[PDB]
Amino acid sequence: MGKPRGLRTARKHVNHRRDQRWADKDYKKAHLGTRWKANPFGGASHAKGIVLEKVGVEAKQPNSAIRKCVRVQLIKNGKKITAFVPRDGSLNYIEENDEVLVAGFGRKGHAVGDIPGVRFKVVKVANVSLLALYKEKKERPRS
Amino acid sequence: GRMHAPGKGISQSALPYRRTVPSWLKLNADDVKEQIKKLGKKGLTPSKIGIILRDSHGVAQVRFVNGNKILRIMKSVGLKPDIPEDLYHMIKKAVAIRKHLERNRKDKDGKFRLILVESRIHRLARYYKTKSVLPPNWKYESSTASALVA
Amino acid sequence: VRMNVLADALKCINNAEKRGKRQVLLRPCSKVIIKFLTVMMKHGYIGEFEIVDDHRSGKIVVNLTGRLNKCGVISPRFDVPINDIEKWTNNLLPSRQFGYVVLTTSGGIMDHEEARRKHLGGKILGFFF
RNA sequence: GUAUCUAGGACUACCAUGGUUGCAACGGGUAACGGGGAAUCAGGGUUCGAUUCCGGAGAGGGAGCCUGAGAAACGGCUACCACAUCUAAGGAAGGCAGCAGGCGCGUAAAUUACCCACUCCCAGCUCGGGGAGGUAGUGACGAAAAAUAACAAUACAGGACUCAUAUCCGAGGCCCUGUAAUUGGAAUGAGUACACUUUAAAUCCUUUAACAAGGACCAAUUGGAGGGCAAGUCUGGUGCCAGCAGCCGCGGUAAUUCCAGCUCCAAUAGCGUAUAUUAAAGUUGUUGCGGUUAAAACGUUCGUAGUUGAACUUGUGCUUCAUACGUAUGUAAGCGUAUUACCGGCCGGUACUAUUACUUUGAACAAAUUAGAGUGCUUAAAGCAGGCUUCAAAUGCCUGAAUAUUCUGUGCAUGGGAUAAUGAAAUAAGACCUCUGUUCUGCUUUCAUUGGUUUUCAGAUCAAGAGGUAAUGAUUAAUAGAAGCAGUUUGGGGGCAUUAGUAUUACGACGCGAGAGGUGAAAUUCUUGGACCGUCGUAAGACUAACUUAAGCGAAAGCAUUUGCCAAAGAUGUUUUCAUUAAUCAAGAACGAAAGUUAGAGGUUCGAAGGCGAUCAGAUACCGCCCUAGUUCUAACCAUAAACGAUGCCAGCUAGCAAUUGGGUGUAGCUACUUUUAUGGCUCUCUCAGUCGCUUCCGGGAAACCAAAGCUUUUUGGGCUCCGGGGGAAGUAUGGUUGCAAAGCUGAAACUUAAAGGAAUUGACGGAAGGGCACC
RNA sequence: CAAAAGUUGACCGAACUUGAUUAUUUAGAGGAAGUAAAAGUCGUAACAAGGUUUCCGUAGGUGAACCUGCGGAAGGAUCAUUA
């Protein structure tokens, strides 16, 4: 069924393989270097950005919730991202014009769950971490 | 196969097992050889000789009586036609149907089939150039083809 | 047409044993097939094979014990550099104890067991279990 | 020729027209130095490498140069361009991608420490210099080893054992395990800290006094507890709010998901999370996917590259010997145009010999790494130490720091002759050999020496004749293909001329009258009397109802009146020919319904658009009328359709029956006839190749189904192409291409989103279909 | 005989200017898409013959859906019966 299974067909497999791997979604991303070109992270694990605005993101059905996201502009690219503030209360911790760490939601891009267009997480406000602040183990550096 | 059409239909020559026989056949290899020369001089192609002689004689197979096939016999005595007979006939048909198309243009089935008849000539001729029975870079072109048949 | 003649015959054998049928007509039987088939005989996998002299290309009638689960044919004949003998036997053979992988080796068409004794690797023809 | 250390288009004159390319060149991109290597694995692979080594490269970007064995050097110079510096204003001087340090960039990375003691290098050197390197400091990238307590006993707890009693139930009580902040003395230093050891000198370790244990002390975590996923249907607060949730989902007042508490679980000196990668992922498929319907056959074929490719061609054996158990023969030696021939005593050379791909065995494979040998680095990561008679006396005895593979492939050398190709020579200047001293090329010994002449030798090759030698050079014809064909024969195959039939429409004549078309009912529209209709003819254009199919042909689109011609295709048949020609295919091409388009003819019919009557909120529609482009034909486009049998093509094989198309073998079958025949058609019988059906699989599948969608393996099967790898965006954007244009091809992504599709099942529901049942 | 500043002709040629070219980035009136849509406005298009079977190619017209015309297919509502 198909494959050139002859003794000296040897080039043809490689050629055809590259024609088939053209369609391979992970290899498209790798070869075409889409991370650096289109994705707001330049394949860079974290990005520090500046907080523009706090957004009251209305959830997709069957869930009626106001799910509290934050608009962030990365220092390297000026690119606008909406990132979610995970773990409790948290917009109260964000404060407009603070320096915030933008991390992703572990989803190979793709918008969260029932949360429209929020491909990203927040892990830190003012270099402390959100996480520490909720538990109360740490207290916010002044300004 | 049937490369021109989908047609699976094979009908081919069942050759009698006995490689030396027939025993009843009074006639020498010289006798059959002589008739092959005479009929070939009359302008009979080796196919036409091979069928006519079987019925008229008994020549069961030309190969069996005299060790050499018709074409080989003709060649040794120098009766061999410049282009092997199978090409001659294909080339005759291609010229004939091309002449038909000049007369009756817009036969869409005929032109399509015109390509098939040239296509087979080129391929079959390609083999003979390998045998060197055709001088290397011998080419089928239509201009010359018309003359060739006649 | 029939680029590898080998596989066409050995498929016929599989299909035949799938009925349970003790006989098969094989077409158009090669030297490689004759050597494949003699290799079968030694381990008792098939009963007697007989090659009829048509002045055409040789047909074979196979007599089958039915000891054979399945017989497969390798094309392309992948170059075995002696230590891929171990890899190829593991993959397609049901057991390490039994089942012969069949090669075209320098000294003949031989099983991998025989090939190991002679220390002559090869190109792979086949698998019989 | 010049240059140079050197070959060399490195450079230059002259002179040729070459060199590279679908085996992807040239160009563009690359978080692209390369390799040794690393990561992750069942293997196979995939990914990584900027960095601890090796080689090369560069030193802001570039160029030029001196010295010197060596630098086109930058911690040399000279220049420019860009940067930076000082200045008494004339000028001059510089390269942290060296070590620290600072700034900036960023997700992201340390001390303005000490030393040549170790390691070693350079120098004129025993000695100096050394941010080469070592040393400390910083360092949860990462790896490696675990301090943080333990036992009786007391307080009650469990489980055996006993006394019991034997649902119940109490008393004695044990190796224990514990829930207790009850007790009691013990243990051992992590830490601390003399001292010693370390060290160049300090540091920490390895040592060890003095010190340190009732945790509240020597005082552990980070996520989770609805499910995935391990553990609360807990308690307060909140109540689809806050917020939670990688996903599905939770939260609308028993919240087992929230926020806490409490209880607990899972992994604890680590764990969470992000990003990249790999496993899973069979979701990339070489190994090893899918394509009827799930995402998938290009409309179809020709067809070149590519790719693939049938059978036949040193080989079987016989005998005996040795050697495992009368055997067996596998091993050894014999015998039949490549194991023939010497020399030296079967051995070992020499003379030797089809090309390859492959494969075999060798060398040649950098260390680290990787695997791992030897070995108690006190464990261990691993270090490469060290162990021994012996802590005696003592260099005494000593093993060491292997072996493999990754450094692939390749190349070298060697063996095999299977597989797949190639090879003479059938237009025989064919292969040997041998005879012409025939031919041509061609010579150092010895004729004392040295030179000239010519013989032998023909030193040693070649080429040309003639003869003898030869199995003397032509393999089958794949239930492969090509081709012709005795021919038989098929078909709505194609083109052209032609022919018939009625109708639809229109017209006239005739003829009789006030209605007619049309529908759900109607009205428009047709008629003022002669529509509409009848009858008769004729004009125009179109088209072949029924017959006509599970029926044919054609490569496919498509092809249904008659007849003629021209050529084609296919099945059958062929003891014809050819003798692997072939199979399938990027590219490229041929044909390619309809609409749409260019120009005519043609326009009857139907009839997009328009305008009309009803219907209907709307009708713009279905419906009714008029009808345009269009249908048709011709010369051109277009290249697309459910171009569908949603199913690539070629080959073999795997199941019964009856149809069905065609040919053939037998018809002592019926009928047609000549005195009966001979002939023909059909059945009957038999068989191929065609298209399918039925019912079963005797396999596949998720099923519906499928005799192919089977043989698709147990991660495999003949050969070959094309296409899919979540759903949408999107067949769109963009560019290129083709097109007159309409369009068509090639064909993304951003971003969006947890489903999406197919199946069958049962319900519900129908202005889908059939039965019943009741004076709601 | 050595020999400085200067200097002749050559070859390398940084650098600069201007045309051409390529890769890569990014402003933009406005136009024209898609998406999130999640309380809306207008229709019922398809899903049962969706009350006009569905659906394809292609053109035009309708507010839109869509309708219509021409040729199709069945993924139909005919796997059919019907001398």
Side-chain angles (χ1 to χ4, degrees):
Chain A
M1 295 300 300
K3 295 167 183 173
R5 287 191 182 188
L7 310 168
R8 296 186 183 195
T9 46
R11 67 175 106 270
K12 302 184 68 179
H13 305 292
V14 190
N15 288 327
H16 291 310
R17 264 178 266 208
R18 297 178 189 180
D19 296 317
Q20 285 177 292
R21 285 174 189 177
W22 232 123
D24 191 81
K25 196 165 180 183
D26 302 349
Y27 296 158
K28 287 180 178 186
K29 294 160 176 171
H31 302 315
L32 304 179
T34 61
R35 305 96 199 235
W36 306 71
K37 292 181 178 179
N39 290 257
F41 292 169
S45 64
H46 282 286
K48 290 172 179 172
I50 312 167
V51 166
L52 287 166
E53 290 175 71
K54 300 171 186 170
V55 189
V57 183
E58 301 195 353
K60 313 167 208 171
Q61 314 180 292
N63 298 303
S64 48
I66 312 182
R67 294 177 179 181
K68 284 74 197 302
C69 301
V70 166
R71 289 183 174 171
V72 198
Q73 294 183 307
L74 307 186
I75 301 174
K76 283 185 177 189
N77 292 292
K79 281 177 179 186
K80 303 177 184 173
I81 283 177
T82 62
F84 175 56
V85 204
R87 305 159 186 181
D88 185 61
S90 71
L91 290 190
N92 296 285
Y93 292 70
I94 280 272
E95 305 170 7
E96 314 192 357
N97 305 284
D98 278 48
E99 306 179 4
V100 154
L101 273 286
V102 180
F105 237 122
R107 304 204 79 242
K108 312 171 180 169
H110 297 206
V112 212
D114 286 298
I115 320 182
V118 201
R119 289 192 183 173
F120 295 95
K121 291 189 173 182
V122 176
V123 173
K124 300 215 279 296
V125 184
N127 305 288
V128 198
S129 83
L130 290 177
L131 313 176
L133 298 164
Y134 313 124
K135 285 198 170 181
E136 303 178 0
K137 294 178 197 178
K138 302 204 187 185
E139 299 177 1
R140 312 176 197 157
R142 297 181 187 183
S143 64
Chain B
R2 196 110 268 190
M3 67 165 104
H4 313 109
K8 278 58 73 174
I10 92 93
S11 185
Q12 311 179 250
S13 64
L15 210 126
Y17 202 76
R18 294 186 168 189
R19 285 194 162 180
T20 176
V21 110
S23 303
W24 55 271
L25 183 60
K26 308 298 189 184
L27 302 312
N28 203 234
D30 195 87
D31 200 73
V32 300
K33 196 183 284 296
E34 203 289 304
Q35 290 296 107
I36 293 163
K37 296 168 187 178
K38 187 60 59 180
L39 276 310
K41 292 175 192 167
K42 203 176 291 184
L44 281 65
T45 67
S47 293
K48 296 173 175 183
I49 295 178
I51 61 181
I52 204 71
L53 296 188
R54 185 228 275 155
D55 281 71
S56 183
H57 294 68
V59 192
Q61 277 170 52
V62 181
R63 33 180 176 263
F64 282 175
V65 189
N66 177 260
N68 292 114
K69 304 70 162 190
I70 313 100
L71 184 142
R72 291 83 171 183
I73 291 174
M74 283 180 66
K75 184 277 304 187
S76 304
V77 193
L79 280 46
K80 196 170 182 177
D82 52 287
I83 295 193
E85 50 169 334
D86 56 347
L87 286 171
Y88 174 84
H89 280 88
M90 297 153 72
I91 294 167
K92 168 176 169 293
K93 262 61 179 63
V95 166
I97 77 183
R98 182 172 283 276
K99 189 178 185 184
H100 158 57
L101 284 157
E102 301 305 287
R103 300 176 300 203
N104 296 313
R105 295 178 178 121
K106 192 160 78 303
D107 179 21
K108 313 306 294 283
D109 206 82
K111 53 170 69 65
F112 180 84
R113 297 281 220 294
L114 205 207
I115 294 168
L116 306 187
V117 297
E118 301 182 289
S119 192
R120 67 188 67 160
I121 292 160
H122 295 304
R123 290 168 60 121
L124 200 286
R126 200 175 299 128
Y127 171 54
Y128 279 142
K129 287 190 306 188
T130 312
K131 295 197 81 63
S132 203
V133 77
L134 275 180
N137 66 58
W138 187 85
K139 55 159 61 282
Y140 174 84
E141 57 186 18
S142 57
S143 303
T144 61
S146 299
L148 225 177
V149 176
Chain C
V1 185
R2 301 190 181 110
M3 305 303 209
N4 288 255
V5 149
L6 324 180
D8 289 2
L10 276 158
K11 266 183 185 191
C12 297
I13 292 171
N14 289 7
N15 288 324
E17 286 183 311
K18 288 164 179 181
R19 282 177 292 183
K21 203 170 191 179
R22 293 192 180 161
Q23 290 188 329
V24 206
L25 258 163
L26 312 184
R27 295 177 184 81
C29 316
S30 53
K31 193 154 187 188
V32 181
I33 279 175
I34 296 172
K35 292 173 173 175
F36 245 151
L37 293 183
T38 55
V39 155
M40 296 271 206
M41 284 314 305
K42 296 171 182 185
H43 311 306
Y45 282 135
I46 302 181
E48 306 195 292
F49 296 101
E50 306 203 58
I51 319 169
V52 87
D53 292 54
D54 290 290
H55 309 310
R56 303 174 199 258
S57 51
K59 302 170 198 175
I60 284 172
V61 177
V62 186
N63 297 313
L64 290 157
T65 45
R67 296 172 166 193
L68 282 163
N69 298 302
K70 286 202 214 176
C71 293
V73 174
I74 297 243
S75 37
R77 314 176 181 113
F78 313 100
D79 305 357
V80 198
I82 225 159
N83 297 298
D84 296 357
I85 275 181
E86 293 174 283
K87 300 173 182 177
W88 280 115
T89 54
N90 297 1
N91 297 318
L92 297 173
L93 298 174
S95 48
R96 323 174 192 196
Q97 307 173 79
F98 308 118
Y100 294 86
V101 194
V102 198
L103 285 151
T104 15
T105 70
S106 52
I109 285 164
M110 306 307 286
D111 304 278
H112 275 219
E113 285 192 60
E114 305 182 287
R116 287 160 178 159
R117 296 174 190 131
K118 296 180 178 191
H119 297 280
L120 298 172
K123 289 193 169 194
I124 309 172
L125 282 180
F127 277 78
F128 297 153
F129 46 95

